[PDB]
PDB file of C-alpha atoms and ligand atoms in Angstrom:
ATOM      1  CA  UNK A   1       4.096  13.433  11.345  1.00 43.86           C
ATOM      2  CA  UNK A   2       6.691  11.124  10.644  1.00 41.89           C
ATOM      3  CA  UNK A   3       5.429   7.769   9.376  1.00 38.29           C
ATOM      4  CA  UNK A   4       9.640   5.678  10.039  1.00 39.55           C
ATOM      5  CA  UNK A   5       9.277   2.926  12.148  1.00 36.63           C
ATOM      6  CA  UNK A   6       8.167  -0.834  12.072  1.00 39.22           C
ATOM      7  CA  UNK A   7       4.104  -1.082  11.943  1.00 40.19           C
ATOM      8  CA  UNK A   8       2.252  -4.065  12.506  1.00 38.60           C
ATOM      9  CA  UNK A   9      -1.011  -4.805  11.336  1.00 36.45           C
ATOM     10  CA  UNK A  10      -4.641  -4.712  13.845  1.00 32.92           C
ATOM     11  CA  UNK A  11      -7.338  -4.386  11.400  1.00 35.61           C
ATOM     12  CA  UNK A  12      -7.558  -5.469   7.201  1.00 36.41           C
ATOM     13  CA  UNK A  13     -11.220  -5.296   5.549  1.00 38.04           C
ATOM     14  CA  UNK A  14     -11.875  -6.116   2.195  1.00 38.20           C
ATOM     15  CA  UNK A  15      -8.853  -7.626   1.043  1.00 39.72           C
ATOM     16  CA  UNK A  16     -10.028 -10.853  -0.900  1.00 39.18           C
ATOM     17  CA  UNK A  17     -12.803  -8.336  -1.948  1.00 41.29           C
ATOM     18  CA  UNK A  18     -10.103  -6.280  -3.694  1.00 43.51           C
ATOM     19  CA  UNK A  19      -8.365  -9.142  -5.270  1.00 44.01           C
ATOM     20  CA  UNK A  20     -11.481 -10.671  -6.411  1.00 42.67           C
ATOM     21  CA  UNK A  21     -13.047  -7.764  -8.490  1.00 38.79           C
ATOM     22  CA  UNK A  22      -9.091  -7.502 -10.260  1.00 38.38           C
ATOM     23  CA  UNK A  23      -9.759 -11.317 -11.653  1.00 39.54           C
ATOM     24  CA  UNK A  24      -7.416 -12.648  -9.143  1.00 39.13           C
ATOM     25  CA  UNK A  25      -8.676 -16.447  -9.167  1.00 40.41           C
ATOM     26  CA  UNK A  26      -9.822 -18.149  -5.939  1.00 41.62           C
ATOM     27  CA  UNK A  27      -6.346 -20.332  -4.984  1.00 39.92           C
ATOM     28  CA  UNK A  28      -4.185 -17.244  -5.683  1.00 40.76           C
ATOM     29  CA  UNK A  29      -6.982 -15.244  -3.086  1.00 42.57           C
ATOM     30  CA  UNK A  30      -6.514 -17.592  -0.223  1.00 41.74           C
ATOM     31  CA  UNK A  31      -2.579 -18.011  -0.537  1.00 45.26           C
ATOM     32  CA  UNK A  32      -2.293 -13.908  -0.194  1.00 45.96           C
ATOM     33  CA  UNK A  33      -4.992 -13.752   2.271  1.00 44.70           C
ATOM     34  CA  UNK A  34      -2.428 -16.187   4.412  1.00 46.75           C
ATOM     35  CA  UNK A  35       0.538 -14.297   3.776  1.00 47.54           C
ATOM     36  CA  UNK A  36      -1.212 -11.148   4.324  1.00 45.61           C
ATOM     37  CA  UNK A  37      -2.407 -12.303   7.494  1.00 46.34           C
ATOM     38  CA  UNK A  38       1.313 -11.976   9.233  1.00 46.58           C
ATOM     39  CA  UNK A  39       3.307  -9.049   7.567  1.00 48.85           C
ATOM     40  CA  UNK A  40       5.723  -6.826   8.374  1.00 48.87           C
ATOM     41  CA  UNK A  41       6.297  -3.326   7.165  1.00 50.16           C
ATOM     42  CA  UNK A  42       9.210  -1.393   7.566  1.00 51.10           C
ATOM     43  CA  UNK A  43       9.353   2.693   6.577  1.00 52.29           C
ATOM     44  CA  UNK A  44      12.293   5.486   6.448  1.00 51.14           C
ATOM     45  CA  UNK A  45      11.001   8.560   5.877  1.00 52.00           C
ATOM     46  CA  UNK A  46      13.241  11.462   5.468  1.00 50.41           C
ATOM     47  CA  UNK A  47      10.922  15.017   4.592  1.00 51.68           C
ATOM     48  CA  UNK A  48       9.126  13.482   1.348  1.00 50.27           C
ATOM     49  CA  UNK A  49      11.878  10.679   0.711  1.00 47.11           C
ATOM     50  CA  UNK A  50      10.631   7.411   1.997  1.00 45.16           C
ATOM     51  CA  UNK A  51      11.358   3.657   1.649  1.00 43.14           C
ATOM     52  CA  UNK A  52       8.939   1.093   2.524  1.00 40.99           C
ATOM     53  CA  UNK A  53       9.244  -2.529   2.657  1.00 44.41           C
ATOM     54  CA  UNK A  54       6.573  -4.903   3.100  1.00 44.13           C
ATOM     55  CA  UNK A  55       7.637  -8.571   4.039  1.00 43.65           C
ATOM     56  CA  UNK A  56       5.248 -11.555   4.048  1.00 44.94           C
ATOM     57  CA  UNK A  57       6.217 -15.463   3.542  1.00 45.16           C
ATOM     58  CA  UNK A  58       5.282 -14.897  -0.083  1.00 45.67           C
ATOM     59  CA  UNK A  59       7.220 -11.884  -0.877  1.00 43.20           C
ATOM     60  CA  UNK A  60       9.440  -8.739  -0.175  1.00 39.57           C
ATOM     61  CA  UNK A  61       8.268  -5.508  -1.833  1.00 38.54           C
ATOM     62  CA  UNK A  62      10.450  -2.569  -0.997  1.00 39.48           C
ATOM     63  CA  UNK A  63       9.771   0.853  -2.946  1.00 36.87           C
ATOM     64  CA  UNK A  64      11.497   4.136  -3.064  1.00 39.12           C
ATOM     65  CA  UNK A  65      10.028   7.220  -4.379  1.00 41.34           C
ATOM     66  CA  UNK A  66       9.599  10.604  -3.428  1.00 42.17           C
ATOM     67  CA  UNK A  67       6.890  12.955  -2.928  1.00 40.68           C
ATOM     68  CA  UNK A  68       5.688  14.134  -6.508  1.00 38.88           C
ATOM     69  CA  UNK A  69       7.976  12.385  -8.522  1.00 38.72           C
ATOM     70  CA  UNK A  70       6.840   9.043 -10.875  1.00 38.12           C
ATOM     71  CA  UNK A  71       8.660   6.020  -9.901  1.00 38.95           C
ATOM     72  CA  UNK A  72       7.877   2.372 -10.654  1.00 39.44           C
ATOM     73  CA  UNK A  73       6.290  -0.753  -8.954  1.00 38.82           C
ATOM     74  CA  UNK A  74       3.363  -2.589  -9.041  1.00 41.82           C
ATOM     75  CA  UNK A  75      -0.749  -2.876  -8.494  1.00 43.11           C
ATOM     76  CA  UNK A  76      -1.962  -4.944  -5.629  1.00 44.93           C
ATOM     77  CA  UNK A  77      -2.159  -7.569  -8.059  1.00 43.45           C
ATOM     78  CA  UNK A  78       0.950  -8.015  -9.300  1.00 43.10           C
ATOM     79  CA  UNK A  79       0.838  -5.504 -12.476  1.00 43.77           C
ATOM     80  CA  UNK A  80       3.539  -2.897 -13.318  1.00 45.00           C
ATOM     81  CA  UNK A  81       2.843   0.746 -12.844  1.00 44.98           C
ATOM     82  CA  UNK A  82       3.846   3.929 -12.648  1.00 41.14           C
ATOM     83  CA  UNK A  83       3.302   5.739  -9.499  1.00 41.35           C
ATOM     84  CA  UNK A  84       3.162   9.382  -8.372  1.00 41.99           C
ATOM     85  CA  UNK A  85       2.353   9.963  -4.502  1.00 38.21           C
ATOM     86  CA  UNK A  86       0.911  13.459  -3.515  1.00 39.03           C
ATOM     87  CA  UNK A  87       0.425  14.985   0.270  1.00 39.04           C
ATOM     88  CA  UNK A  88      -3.558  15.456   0.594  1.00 38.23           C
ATOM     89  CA  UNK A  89      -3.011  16.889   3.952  1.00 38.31           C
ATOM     90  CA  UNK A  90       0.110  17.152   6.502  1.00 39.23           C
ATOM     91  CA  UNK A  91      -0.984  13.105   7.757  1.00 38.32           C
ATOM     92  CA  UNK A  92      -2.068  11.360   4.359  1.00 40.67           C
ATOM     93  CA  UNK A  93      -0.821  11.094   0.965  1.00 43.66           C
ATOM     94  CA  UNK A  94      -2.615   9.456  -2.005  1.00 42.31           C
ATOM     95  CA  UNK A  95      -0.738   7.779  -4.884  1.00 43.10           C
ATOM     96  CA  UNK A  96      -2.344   7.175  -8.292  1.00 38.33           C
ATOM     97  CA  UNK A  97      -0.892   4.400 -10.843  1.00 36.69           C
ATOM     98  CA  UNK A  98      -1.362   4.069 -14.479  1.00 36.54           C
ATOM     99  CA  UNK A  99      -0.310   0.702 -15.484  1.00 37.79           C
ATOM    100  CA  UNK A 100       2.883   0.006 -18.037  1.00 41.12           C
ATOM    101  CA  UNK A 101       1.555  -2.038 -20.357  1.00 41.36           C
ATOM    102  CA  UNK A 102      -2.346  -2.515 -21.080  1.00 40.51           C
ATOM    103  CA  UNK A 103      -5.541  -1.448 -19.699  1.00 38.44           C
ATOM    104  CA  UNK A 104      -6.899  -2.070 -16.511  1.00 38.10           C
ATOM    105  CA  UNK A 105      -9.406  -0.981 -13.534  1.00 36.71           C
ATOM    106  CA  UNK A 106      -8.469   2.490 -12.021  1.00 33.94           C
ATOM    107  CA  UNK A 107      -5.992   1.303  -8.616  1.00 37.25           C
ATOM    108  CA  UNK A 108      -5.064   3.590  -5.986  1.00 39.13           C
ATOM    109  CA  UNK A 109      -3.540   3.622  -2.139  1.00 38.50           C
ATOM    110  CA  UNK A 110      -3.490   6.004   0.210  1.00 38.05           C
ATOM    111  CA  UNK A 111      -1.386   6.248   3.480  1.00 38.64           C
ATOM    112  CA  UNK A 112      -2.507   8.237   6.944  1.00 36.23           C
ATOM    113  CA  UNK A 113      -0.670   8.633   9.954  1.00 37.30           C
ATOM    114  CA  UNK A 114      -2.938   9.813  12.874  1.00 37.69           C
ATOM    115  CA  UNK A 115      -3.052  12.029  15.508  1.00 36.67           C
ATOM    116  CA  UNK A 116      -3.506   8.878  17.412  1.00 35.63           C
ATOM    117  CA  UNK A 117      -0.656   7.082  16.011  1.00 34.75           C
ATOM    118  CA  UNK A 118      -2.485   4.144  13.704  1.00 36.39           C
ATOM    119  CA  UNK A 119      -1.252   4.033   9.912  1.00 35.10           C
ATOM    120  CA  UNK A 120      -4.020   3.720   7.812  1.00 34.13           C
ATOM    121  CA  UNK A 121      -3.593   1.778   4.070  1.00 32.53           C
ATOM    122  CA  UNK A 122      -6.623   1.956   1.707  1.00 36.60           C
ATOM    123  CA  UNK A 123      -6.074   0.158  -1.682  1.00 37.24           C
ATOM    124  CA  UNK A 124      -8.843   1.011  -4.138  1.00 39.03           C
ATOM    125  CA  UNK A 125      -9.750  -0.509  -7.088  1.00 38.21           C
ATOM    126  CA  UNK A 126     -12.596   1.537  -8.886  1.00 36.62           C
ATOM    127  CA  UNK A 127     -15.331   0.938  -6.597  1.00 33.25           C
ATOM    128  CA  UNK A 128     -13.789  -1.721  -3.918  1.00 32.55           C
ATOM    129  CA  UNK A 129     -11.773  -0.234  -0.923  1.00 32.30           C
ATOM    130  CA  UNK A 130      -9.515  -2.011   1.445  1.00 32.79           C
ATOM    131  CA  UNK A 131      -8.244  -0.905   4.340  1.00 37.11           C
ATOM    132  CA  UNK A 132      -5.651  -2.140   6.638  1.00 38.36           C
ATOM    133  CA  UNK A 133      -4.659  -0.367   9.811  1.00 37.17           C
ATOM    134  CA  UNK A 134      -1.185  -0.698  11.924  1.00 33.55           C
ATOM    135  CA  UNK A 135       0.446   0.246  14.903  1.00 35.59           C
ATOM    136  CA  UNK A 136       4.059   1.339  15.655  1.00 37.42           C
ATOM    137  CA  UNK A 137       6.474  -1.260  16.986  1.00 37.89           C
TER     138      UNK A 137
HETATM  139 CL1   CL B 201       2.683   0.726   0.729  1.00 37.27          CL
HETATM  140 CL1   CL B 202       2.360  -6.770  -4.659  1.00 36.35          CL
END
């Protein structure tokens, strides 16, 4: 499956619910709820190289990384990391983040393309899951 194209989002549950159990405080929770409401994401895949960007009015976030090796970027809540993405299966990969400096809740996101074409995003945070889906452009 090859995840390149533009994706725009149809579904998003539990997003405040994320940001709210990592201390994010209430005004910070409504202005990324807004710009979260209207993104756009952009991915190149090539084999297990991939950019993605994700563009709202409050940000651009592009990342590079490849399949099994550490690169850098950042927790859903704004927090440095280092991040290593693994396939679980041909249409999903997870990617696990230790932050760079300090302690923090165990955060997480996964990506699935499927059969039927939707990319799925979860973003965990211990216990809380959100999930976003998209469809292609
Ligand atoms: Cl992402
Ligand atoms: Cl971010």
């Amino acid at each position: 499956p090859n995840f390149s194209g533009n994706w725009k989002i149809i579904r998003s549950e539990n997003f405040e619910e994320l940001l709210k159990v990592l201390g994010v405080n209430v005004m910070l929770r409504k202005i990324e709820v807004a710009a979260a409401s209207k993104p756009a994401v952009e991915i190149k895949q090539e084999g297990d190289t991939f950019y993605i960007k994700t563009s709202t009015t409050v940000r651009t976030t592009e990342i590079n990384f490849k399949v099994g090796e550490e690169f850098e970027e950042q927790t859903v809540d704004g927090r440095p990391c280092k991040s290593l993405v693994k396939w679980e299966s041909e249409n999903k990969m997870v990617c696990e983040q230790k932050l760079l400096k300090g302690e923090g809740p165990k955060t997480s996101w996964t990506l699935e393309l499927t059969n039927d074409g939707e990319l799925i995003l979860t973003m965990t945070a211990d216990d809380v899951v959100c999930t976003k889906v998209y469809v292609r452009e």
